[PDB]
Symmetry: C3
Subunit: 252 residues, 3 copies
Amino acid sequence: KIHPSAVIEEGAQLGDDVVIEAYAYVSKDAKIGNNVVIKQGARILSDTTIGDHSRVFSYAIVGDIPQDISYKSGVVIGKNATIREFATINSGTAKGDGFTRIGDNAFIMAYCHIAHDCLLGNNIILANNATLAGHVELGDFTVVGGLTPIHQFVKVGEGCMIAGASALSQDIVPFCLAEGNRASIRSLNLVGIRRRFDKDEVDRLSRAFKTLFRQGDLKENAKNLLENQESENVKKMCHFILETKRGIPVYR
Amino acid sequence: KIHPSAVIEEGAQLGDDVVIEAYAYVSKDAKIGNNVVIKQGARILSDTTIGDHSRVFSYAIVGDIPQDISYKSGVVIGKNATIREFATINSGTAKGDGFTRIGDNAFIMAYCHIAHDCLLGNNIILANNATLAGHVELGDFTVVGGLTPIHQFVKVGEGCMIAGASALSQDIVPFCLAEGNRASIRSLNLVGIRRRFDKDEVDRLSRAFKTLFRQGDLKENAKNLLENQESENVKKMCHFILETKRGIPVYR
Amino acid sequence: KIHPSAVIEEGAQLGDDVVIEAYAYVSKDAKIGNNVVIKQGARILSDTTIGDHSRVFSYAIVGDIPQDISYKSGVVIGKNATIREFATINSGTAKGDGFTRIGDNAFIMAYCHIAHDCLLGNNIILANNATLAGHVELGDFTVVGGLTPIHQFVKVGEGCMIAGASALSQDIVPFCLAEGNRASIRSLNLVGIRRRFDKDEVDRLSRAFKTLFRQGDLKENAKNLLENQESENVKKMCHFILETKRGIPVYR
Ligand SMILES: [Cl-]
Ligand SMILES: [Cl-]
Ligand SMILES: [Cl-]
């Protein structure tokens, strides 16, 4: 199950039923969960954790040092991750806590780049060449389409869709679809929310969207919408708007 | 000619005068044609065929499984292919017939991605980072410039130019140039057709272009243009327009 | 310090305190300077020079043949280069002198592509997936943001900023910021010049910018601005404008 050509540094912790293919690399401080597959040439570097039932594809690099001139450290990836070929997930820095963190059920396609000190939730999907700059945060179920870069310190809420062939500089309210360059909120991510919620929550989210974005001060509108609000999903939108540190981009 | 470090699984079929460099990988079901070069680290996976006089460059991956959550299978590449570094050509699925197929004389530059169940004709050129989503079809002599993604199930006719730093969602009539995001037909691909045809065919194609695209219903205009038509190249445009499944994007 | 798995062809010249990790490749004509690190899988090919204290990261390819159908040769990289993962720096051709050249202090991030016969000065920064086509020249301190391609034979002057998620076809005057697709001069690169010069030079550059770009014939304006001019930095702008071979793109 471990190819003799694999370089597993003394100190690496490997779980049950792990498969390390030829010419892969695991570091002395690496922790490879149970039932994980590391394919030919992939490199798990630094103080990096790969959770159970993850698959790291050929030549993907997890735990390389940050891309930064001025420079305990690593990457933590949850369970059931898929990291496709040539992905570069860099470690964190002392401006965070030394760690880049990814939740469970990540699906990260080829050439994807996740920069130092990112924080991705669960069930994130990154399409080919999506690039997250430093300290980007993505909520659960966010999708980022292909060839789209996200500016450092950007937050994308849960259930967002950031379209491909776009470029994102500001924060994106939960359950919204953003597109363009600079990318802006166009609508709800209707596909994502119809997959997950009932027609009733969906309609609640549509009303909430119009109530927030149609006209007026977004923060004024979010506080008002919190009044007596029944839906925890509309609440996340509202609190996210109130808490925004980079502002929200909106299309007209 | 085969480096000892190369991993050639028992079952791999290798032709005459093949060169497999260090740390490359060939599968038990792979078929490597005569006079082929597989460079260091490249991986020929699954039930994949590489035709004669092809060159697969360092770390290019041919025959990896599709990028898809819900998941006999492979990739067939014709003769005289050039596949540059870090290219990802994924196998097909049972929604096609399990195969991704590329014709002869392919020139596929670095980081290029060809998704499951694509069908590329002959003398295709893909520039750096061009990305084809699932079930994309490209006719003979089509060029796709760099950093351009094509939406799944898109058909591009023969002799098209899809410009770089664009994004393509709809079908592209043969011999046309498309550009933008969303990308649209701007003109004929005048460079491509002047390389291949005489000034007379060229002028026939220019007239045909104006006759099809100037004003009016494109399908009405294509049937009319088929009337008594002398040129097989104008016929392909017309039939392609009539047969279109995703529609044709046109600029104004 | 050299892993046994590394392939160092007889003829390779290696300096003091060099580290070649597992599965890396150095050619018979390669010259690796002192205190250089070649990480796992990276390939130094052809008649290529890597200057002292450079770091080539996992799987980066330096000295591969040009991407060109119609085809002594190599790449020369100055001291203290950082070449991140999966970068493709191709050799030159006989249309130049066979060499692609990069000065000192280069910082080249993941998936970056430098095409045949490029000439990069010192302290260049290329962000993820920046792509230089053939014969591109970049002056000292130029930055090219991420996912931006530069058209072949383009010259970018010293201290330019070419923004990310853009596409560059024309020449860029020194100390300017360019953005868009096609990308155009928007302003000075105020961040770059405030890092390097005093408030006085900065203001001189701002005046010079307005004097050159506000209205009128750019060449007429550059000759006039050369009249009695005190600043060598304003002179470079002016001479560059006068010497331009592809023209200067300017925004309105
Ligand atoms: Cl690293
Ligand atoms: Cl695979
Ligand atoms: Cl090469």
